[PDB]
Amino acid sequence: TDNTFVSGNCDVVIGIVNNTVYDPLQLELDSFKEELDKYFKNHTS
Amino acid sequence: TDNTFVSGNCDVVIGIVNNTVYDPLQLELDSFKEELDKYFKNHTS
Numbered sequence: 205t206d207n208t209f210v211s212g213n214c215d216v217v218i219g220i221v222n223n224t225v226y227d228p229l230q231l232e233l234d235s236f237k238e239e240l241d242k243y244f245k246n247h248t249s
Numbered sequence: 250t251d252n253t254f255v256s257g258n259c260d261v262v263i264g265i266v267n268n269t270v271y272d273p274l275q276l277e278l279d280s281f282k283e284e285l286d287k288y289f290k291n292h293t294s
């Protein structure tokens with residue numbers, strides 16, 4: 205998402221191929237959610 | 250990290266210097282981590 209920009213849906217462009225776009229913020233958010241889950245497990249379980 | 254882009258390692262450029270590149274996202278993430286650690290520590294005690 206840093207070297208790409210979004211403009212509309214993908215029903216207009218002719219020849220648009222369709223592949224995963226990586227988002228670092230979501231990756232670190234998921235990692236921190238996993239860390240919080242581990243902390244909660246250490247708290248109760 | 251917003252001012253600059255990363256390309257390669259430090260063993261190729263002639264004249265590369267020794268300096269910290271500040272990451273605001275990592276700074277706020279570490280602040281959140283410290284806050285959550287203190288929260289859990291005072292919750293346990």
Ligand SMILES: *[C@@H]1O[C@H](CO[C@@H]2O[C@@H](C)[C@@H](O)[C@@H](O)[C@@H]2O)[C@@H](O[C@@H]2O[C@H](CO)[C@@H](O)[C@H](O)[C@H]2NC(C)=O)[C@H](O)[C@H]1NC(C)=O
Nearest residue numbers: 210212213214215216217218219220221222223224225226
């Ligand atoms: C490109 O995506 C199209 C659009 O489908 C969407 O994206 C897919 C990756 C998947 O998550 C779908 O559920 C999404 O709706 C894909 O075309 C789909 O093809 C499947 C298999 O026949 C069909 O069930 C869906 O209905 C199609 N989607 C639509 C909107 O008609 C296409 O497969 C993707 N390209 C590649 C190379 O996988």
Ligand SMILES: *[C@@H]1O[C@H](CO[C@@H]2O[C@@H](C)[C@@H](O)[C@@H](O)[C@@H]2O)[C@@H](O[C@@H]2O[C@H](CO)[C@@H](O)[C@H](O)[C@H]2NC(C)=O)[C@H](O)[C@H]1NC(C)=O
Nearest residue numbers: 256257258259260261262263264265266267268269270271
């Ligand atoms: C630029 O710094 C690197 C590494 O950072 C230094 O060491 C850390 C442990 C920490 O104390 C930092 O603040 C320091 O700035 C230096 O790379 C080292 O170079 C030596 C000599 O060639 C080599 O033996 C080490 O393996 C290197 N270490 C790494 C991690 O690459 C580098 O030399 C510094 N630049 C200059 C001109 O001295």
